[PDB]
Amino acid sequence: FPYAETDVADLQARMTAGELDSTTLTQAYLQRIAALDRTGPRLRAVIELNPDALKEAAERDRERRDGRLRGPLHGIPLLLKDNINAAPMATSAGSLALQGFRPDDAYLVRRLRDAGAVVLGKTNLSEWANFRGNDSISGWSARGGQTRNPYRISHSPCGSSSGSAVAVAANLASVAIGTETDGSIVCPAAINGVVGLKPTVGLVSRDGIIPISFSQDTAGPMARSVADAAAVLTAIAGRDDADPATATMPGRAVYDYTARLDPQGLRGKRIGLLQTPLLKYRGMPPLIEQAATELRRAGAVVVPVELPNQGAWAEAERTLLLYEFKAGLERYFNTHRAPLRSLADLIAFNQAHSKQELGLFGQELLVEADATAGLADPAYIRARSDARRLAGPEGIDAALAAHQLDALVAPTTGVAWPIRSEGDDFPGESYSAAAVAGYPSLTVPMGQIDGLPVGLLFMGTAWSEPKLIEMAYAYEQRTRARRPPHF
């Protein structure tokens, strides 16, 4: 593949020099999607192709020939997780219930299109972003089937942002957008050997996205490099009246995150290496040891630290997600006039189509969520507050303050596991604190264990994306650990 592992800036430079145009790049990815996603290894990372992709690419080329460039992403093809609204494609969250539901563009999609990006299509995801049943299988949806890990197709691509991570790793697009509530961006990113960035809740509008939790939800870029992730973040970040969370950002400005790509970004930094059982995961010691060494040689101070209240928010998070899921999903159904208007309708639909929807696992989360008393319930209010406090101020922040640290690092998760009828064989995580706190996290490829990707996670306090990008980029540039999957 002529564009394999080529950065956004490099592709833009090529198009700007007139050695490449958007239609050629776009058709190249589409041909690759046909050869690896639908056939061959059958990655099934792409759930629907944008019928107007070629039309869009052609328009971006005409604008370029007319001297009307939109910016760094002009003519760059990307993919969107299927819970993000994007006309004229359907937005199903992987469900058969919304197969013919085609709402208008989400705010971030409008920003990407205005930036000149070309939408290739939508990527598969764990159905309903994995908030449907117990013992679920990551990367599976009734409409998109089973997405597979490109490094070993018998293994899990993890998730919920399964297709986005796989598409990026397999070079099916330049970059992709995923969403995270608790691990959905960074876990599949690490599992598939790519970069995943989950920003602070409030940096990127959640408007036009099928939700789970307004307290923890956020869209984020997935790319093969930190530089590409930074270019995408620059395009999607911004205040939106439709999403109150975006009005809480302190001193928001037209910020160019690519300006933070500093090769000396680790000099003078202080990093805390989290002491979790993940450091002892089979084959992990050598990798994390080498990573710490690279960070130190780069000029950073690395000290072992433990996260206060690790996991103490578990119960509170469960409660807040169930309450917020019902409230948010029903608001979304009404706002975009979906064919379903209540969670009860969805539960009923799955039962009526049990053969196609409930053959692998059930819908117990939907059922429990539908029974919640609403957002005025004192129990929910207390849970929402406790979770945020335990993971942020008294969690990540307490750890950062204890040793005056700039960030915390740790292996993101373990390696991919074989896909089986049974639920996922979850190895563990170190990213939940950031997800529950609503703080930024970013994973960068750190190496492999027996051919399967492992990532290094960076977590920081609210609004520290600039600093995290600097550190992650500096680390990435002296390691360049990503290795494409072999087909």
Partner: peptide
Amino acid sequence: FXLF
């Protein structure tokens, strides 16, 4: 409560 994983991977939403």
